[PDB]
Design a protein around this ligand. Structure first.
Ligand SMILES: CCC[C@@H](CC(=O)O)n1c(=O)n(Cc2cc(Br)cc3c2CC(=O)N3)c2ccccc21
Ligand SMILES: *[C@@H]1O[C@H](CO)[C@@H](O)[C@H](O)[C@H]1NC(C)=O
Ligand SMILES: [Zn+2]
Ligand SMILES: [Zn+2]
Length: 215
C-alpha cells in the first residue's frame, strides 16, 4: 500500500495474509479476505503449488495469540483467468478447517478503501504491518491506457493526481466502498502511477456462489 496509514491492529479482521509456494522459486505473498469460515477470496495471479493463510495478523513478523495459520486444501482459480489480459483475476481458497471466530478474525467519484501488507513504495519492501489507503473510484476512461481494461469486468481506482495506490504484495485485498466489498486488487503500472485496475466483484457473484455450494 502506497500513501496509506498503519491500521489499528485487528481493525480489519477479515484480512488474510497469503504465503504462496511454488516449485521453482522462493515464497511469494498476497492478500485476500475471509468470506466464509473456510473460504478466502483473492486474486487468481496468486495461485501456486500450495498456499498458507494467516488470519488475525497485524505485524506479520510478530507471532501472537490472534494468529490462525491455516492450510489451504484446494485452490479454485477462475476457469476463465487469462495471464495475457489478466481478465477474471479471481480465486477462491478452501481452508482445511473452518477458522475460529474471534475479535481479531471474522468474515466480511466515490471514495473506497483498500488494505494490505504490500510494498509501501516502488523500491520499498513489503510492509511488516497492515496498511490502508483511501482511493477514488474513477470513470472507466481513466484506465483506457490499460489496453485490456474492461469496464464490465473491472474497476478503475485511484486519482492520477495522488500517489496513493495498492501495489505489489497487495494482490487479492478487498476494495470496500461504504463498508461493502466492491473490488479486489489486481494490477497496475510498475511505476505505481494511479489509477490501478481492480476486479469488479459483482460480475463474479454467480461463480462465487457456485463454488461455495459445490464444496
Ligand atoms: C504473487 C504476486 C505476484 C506479483 C509479481 C509482480 O509484482 O509482478 N504481483 C503483484 O504483486 N501484483 C499486484 C500489482 C503489481 C503491480 Br507491478 C502493480 C500493482 C499491483 C496491484 C496494484 O494496484 N498495482 C501482480 C499483478 C499481476 C501479476 C503479478 C503480480
Ligand atoms: C514488527 O515486529 C518486529 C518484531 O517484533 C519489530 O522488529 C518491528 O519493529 C515491528 N514493526 C512495527 C511497525 O511494529
Ligand atoms: Zn494483536
Ligand atoms: Zn466472466
Amino acid at each position: 500500500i502506497i500513501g496509506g496509514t498503519e491500521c489499528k491492529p485487528h481493525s480489519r479482521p477479515y484480512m488474510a495474509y497469503l504465503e504462496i509456494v511454488t516449485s521453482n522459486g522462493p515464497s511469494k505473498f498476497c492478500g485476500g479476505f475471509l468470506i466464509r469460515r473456510n473460504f478466502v477470496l483473492t486474486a487468481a495471479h496468486c495461485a501456486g503449488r500450495s498456499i498458507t493463510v494467516t488470519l488475525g495478523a497485524h505485524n506479520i513478523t510478530e507471532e501472537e495469540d490472534t494468529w490462525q495459520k491455516l492450510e489451504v486444501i484446494k485452490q479454485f482459480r477462475h476457469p476463465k483467468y487469462n495471464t495475457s489480459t489478466l481478465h477474471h483475476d479471481i480465486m477462491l481458497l478452501k481452508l482445511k478447517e473452518k477458522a475460529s471466530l474471534t475479535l481479531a478474525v471474522g468474515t466480511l467519484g466515490r471514495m473506497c478503501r483498500v488494505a494490505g501488507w504490500g510494498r509501501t513504495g516502488v523500491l520499498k519492501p513489503g510492509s511488516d504491518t497492515l496498511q490502508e489507503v483511501k482511493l477514488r473510484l474513477m470513470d472507466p476512461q481513466a484506465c483506457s491506457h490499460f489496453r485490456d481494461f474492461d469496464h464490465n469486468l473491472q474497476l478503475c481506482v485511484g486519482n492520477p493526481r495522488k500517489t496513493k495506490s495498492a501495489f505489489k504484495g497487495d494482490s487479492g485485498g478487498p476494495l470496500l466502498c461504504a463498508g461493502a466489498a466492491q473490488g479486489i486488487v489486481s494490477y497496475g503500472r510498475s511505476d505505481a502511477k494511479p489509477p490501478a485496475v481492480f476486479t469488479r466483484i459483482s460480475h463474479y457473484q454467480p461463480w462465487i456462489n457456485q463454488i461455495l455450494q459445490a464444496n
